[PDB]
């Protein structure tokens, strides 16, 4: 119950951050919330990182980790993702 409401807030926070910021100069991937992580505006041909989402029940023990995603050279996001640093450490 509280997990999902915190997850809702994380998604709301992502929309707000995009609506109160602009992308960097040049070709850049559009910001997007993919139901797991909030992806910010990212320069083309780079691998983006954002902190492990603070809605995870185990966020405290992964708070210094990141999830990664590729921003293609065409300003388009990739479909692959590395969220190993955000896994539940049992």
């Amino acid at each position, epitope marked *: 119950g509280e997990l999902y409401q915190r997850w809702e*807030h994380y998604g709301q926070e992502c929309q707000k951050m995009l609506e*109160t*910021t602009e992308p960097p100069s040049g070709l850049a991937c559009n910001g997007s919330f993919d139901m797991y992580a909030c992806w910010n505006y990212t320069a083309a041909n780079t691998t983006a990182r954002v902190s492990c989402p603070w809605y995870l029940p185990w966020f405290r023990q992964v708070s210094a980790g990141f999830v990664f995603r590729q921003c293609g050279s065409d300003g388009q996001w990739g479909s692959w993702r590395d969220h190993t640093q955000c896994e539940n450490p049992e």
Partner: antibody
Amino acid sequence: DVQLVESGGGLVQPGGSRKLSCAASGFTFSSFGMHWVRQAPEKGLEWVAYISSGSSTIYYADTVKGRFTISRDNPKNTLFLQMTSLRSEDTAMYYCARGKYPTWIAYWGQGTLVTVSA
Amino acid sequence: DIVMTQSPSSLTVTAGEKVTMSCKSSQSLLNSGNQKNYLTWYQQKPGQPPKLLISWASTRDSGVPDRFTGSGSGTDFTLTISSVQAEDLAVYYCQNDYSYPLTFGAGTKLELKR
């Protein structure tokens, strides 16, 4: 620098209509959500309406919902506020505002004064 | 709707002294998820539009000097101005930035003893 220049204020008869405009420059207008905030003379600040960058989500204050319509023209870098069924209590200086994470409201325009009177 | 209550309604101080004003919300502005308080302060000079001072309770906007300090959490918040200057004459508003509708306090008017 960011600057918002409001326009369209003046005298409106009680129950009439009036459309305010807000010309923005110094930032990527199409990337920001925009607000209208008003201030009755000698009184405080009251948030009125918000429109997201793509006009996909919109919030209105209760005292305004049903009468005012917020809209924008991104290519022309312009925010609009269409007011209808105005009354004496709508008399205020009307500000348009842009956000700056982490806040919804950061930069304010000079404002335009709307007087509702017979 | 969250009601924002500011006190004092106004006060007067001489240049060089330090002032403190309070801002209270009828509901908590603390997001326990990210541990941030959604409280923002504005400074409105006479005859000017409001100016962003502090966001997320304590984060000064770029250009705002150190003598403006925001603090508090939950429902109790405070703005503190040290080495008050003549130009600090303004009405100081706090605003609920947590949820819509966004609501402002009635303001604290800072006047100067001369």
